[PDB]
């Protein structure tokens, strides 16, 4: 199917507690495969998936050089953005960046992404054309001028259409037994009385990969979007994910409710009911 690669950077200042920390993590879909942390005892790019371990020392040294240089660049950027917003030297601030490439089921580039935020708010983003920018405010317009001068958009477009897709396809091949394997959810419906007149129906989905899933409750074939308690999809810690959806139903009407499950790993979508 469809696949993506993303790098996530977090740069966080901490006045009076040393220089800003820089974190980089890399993902293919919902699988992390690398980490870099400037606070580590010996900062170096480390593997976080078994299929990346086969990469040679030149790969690891190249990644570490890039992240060590980004650690320095982001310290300068934090200083600059503090100035752009006329902020005091006392508070802790964060720059985040998320970028990467999306492939379609044919392996071709669907689109590229490059987005930055400041204190959790959109700051600057590379437009879908991979040539122009969307600056959130007059501070981000200063960054936009600097990035145009360094021809950042052109360098990003070359990477997103080039190295990004090439390395993503390499990883998908090297890790094909897990990255190209969709594990369907294991499902069940639980029933718990909340009173004499009402009961909770909980529809579970366990052990699935990737994290993308649709869990809905219907009453007489009508979506119960408003009355459904949906927990955020959560990691199991073994690469798989979990989710549940619950509805409080009148006692005796349980059979009017159906749980619907959509996931990439299922031979066919599921319709489940409480089985007393």
């Amino acid at each position: 199917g469809s696949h993506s690669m993303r790098y996530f950077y977090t740069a966080m200042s901490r006045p009076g507690r040393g220089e800003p920390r820089f974190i980089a993590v890399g993902y293919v879909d919902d699988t992390q495969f690398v980490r870099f942390d400037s606070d580590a005892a010996s900062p170096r790019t480390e593997p976080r998936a078994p299929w990346i371990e086969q990469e040679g020392p030149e790969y690891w040294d190249r990644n570490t050089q890039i992240f060590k240089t980004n650690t320095q660049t982001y310290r300068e950027s934090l200083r600059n953005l503090r100035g752009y917003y006329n902020q005091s030297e006392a508070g802790s601030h964060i720059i985040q960046r998320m970028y990467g490439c999306d492939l379609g089921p044919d392996g071709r580039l669907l689109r590229g992404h490059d987005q930055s935020a400041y204190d959790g708010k959109d700051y600057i983003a590379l437009n879908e054309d991979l040539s122009s920018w969307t600056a959130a405010d007059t501070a981000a317009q200063i960054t936009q001028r600097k990035w145009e001068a360094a021809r950042v958009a052109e360098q990003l477009r070359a990477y997103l259409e080039g190295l990004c897709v090439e390395w993503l396809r390499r990883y998908l091949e090297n890790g094909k037994e897990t990255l190209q394997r969709a594990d369907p959810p294991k499902t069940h419906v639980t029933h718990h009385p909340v009173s004499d007149h009402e009961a909770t129906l909980r529809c579970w989905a366990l052990g699935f990969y990737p994290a993308e899933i649709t869990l809905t409750w219907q009453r007489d074939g009508e979506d119960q979007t408003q009355d459904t308690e949906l927990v955020e999809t959560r990691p199991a810690g073994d690469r798989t994910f979990q989710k549940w959806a619950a509805v409080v139903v009148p006692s005796g009407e349980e059979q009017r409710y159906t749980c619907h499950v959509q996931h990439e790993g299922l031979p066919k979508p599921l319709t489940l009911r409480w089985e007393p």
Binding site: Y7, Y9, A24, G26, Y59, R62, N63, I66, F67, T69, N70, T73, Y74, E76, S77, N80, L81, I95, R97, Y99, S116, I124, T143, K146, W147, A150, V152, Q155, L156, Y159, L163, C164, W167
Partner: peptide
């Protein structure tokens, strides 16, 4: 593989 540069903002 990551993008090779981060340009000062």
């Amino acid at each position: 593989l990551p993008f090779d540069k981060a340009t000062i903002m």
